[PDB]
């Protein structure tokens, strides 16, 4: 609906920066609404979710196991991990660094992974074989949150973000056990309370990942729905502003009550 890209401008106008826009039906993978949808901005934590899906299909390939059991160094720890931390003694198996680094946004829980797959080369080789040609990791964390302006690194575009979930989410490309993996991990989403969730009415269904980011950078990825049934794929990014997280937070919030109220 045109008014909630009225209120897309208005946050742009409010935050003092870009905001990139998807709204997707899920069936027909046709865009409903869109604002700047070829610009780059930086993915954050958001890449996780396409991790774990990279993940996933090698466990559909037989190449990789959920219960495989990864022990690590208190060396690759680093900020934000409070899953791993944890778990220095007894190690975690793939399905667990997946949960950790979806549901909690666990930073070494993504780097552990990253490294049982080849690293951000081989996430970028597998978004292109899955026709993603423009979405890219090319980092590890924290480095990938850094944001410079014009820096292609680490970077996707609204439209293919949105597109690349839905392919994840509802495509051939993963077997249908690892669709429901992975949207079950997304709607366990434990560290998104502030954004699309604080807009949405008790009974719908949402599955997401945000990412926050320096420069201001702030994003967040959704499949979302009412009566318990996801229909839709929203995709919001935003970099640059100089706003706190809270009001951040309460932009990206406020065009999610926009699309719903105009659902």
């Not at 989410?169 to 366990?188: F, H, K, N, P």
């Not at 229909?231 to 926009?258: K, L």
Request: hydrophobic share 40%.
């Amino acid at each position: 609906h045109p008014e909630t890209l009225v209120k897309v401008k208005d946050a742009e106008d409010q935050l003092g920066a870009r905001v990139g826009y998807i709204e997707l039906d899920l069936n027909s993978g046709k865009i409903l609404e869109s604002f700047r949808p070829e610009e780059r901005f930086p993915m954050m934590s958001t890449f996780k979710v396409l991790l774990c899906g990279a993940v996933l299909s090698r466990v559909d390939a037989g190449q990789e196991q959920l219960g495989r059991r990864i022990h690590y160094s208190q060396n690759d720890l680093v900020e934000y991990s409070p899953v791993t931390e944890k778990h220095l003694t007894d190690g975690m198996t793939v399905r667990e660094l997946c949960s950790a680094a979806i549901t909690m946004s666990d930073n070494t829980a993504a780097n552990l992974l990253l490294t049982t797959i080849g690293g951000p080369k081989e996430l970028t080789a597998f978004l292109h074989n899955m026709g993603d040609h423009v979405t890219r990791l090319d980092r590890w964390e924290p480095e990938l949150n850094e944001a410079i302006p014009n820096d292609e690194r680490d970077t996707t575009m609204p439209a293919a973000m949105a597109t690349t979930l839905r392919k994840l989410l509802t495509g051939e490309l993963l077997t249908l056990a690892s669709r429901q993996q992975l949207i079950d991990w997304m709607e366990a989403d434990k560290v998104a309370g502030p954004l699309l969730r604080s807009a949405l009415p008790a009974g719908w269904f949402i599955a997401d990942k945000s990412g926050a980011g320096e420069r201001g950078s702030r994003g967040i990825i959704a499949a979302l729905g009412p009566d318990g049934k996801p229909s839709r794929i929203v995709v919001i990014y935003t970099t640059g502003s100089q706003a706190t997280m809270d009001e951040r937070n309460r932009q990206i919030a406020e065009i999610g009550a926009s699309l719903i109220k105009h659902w």
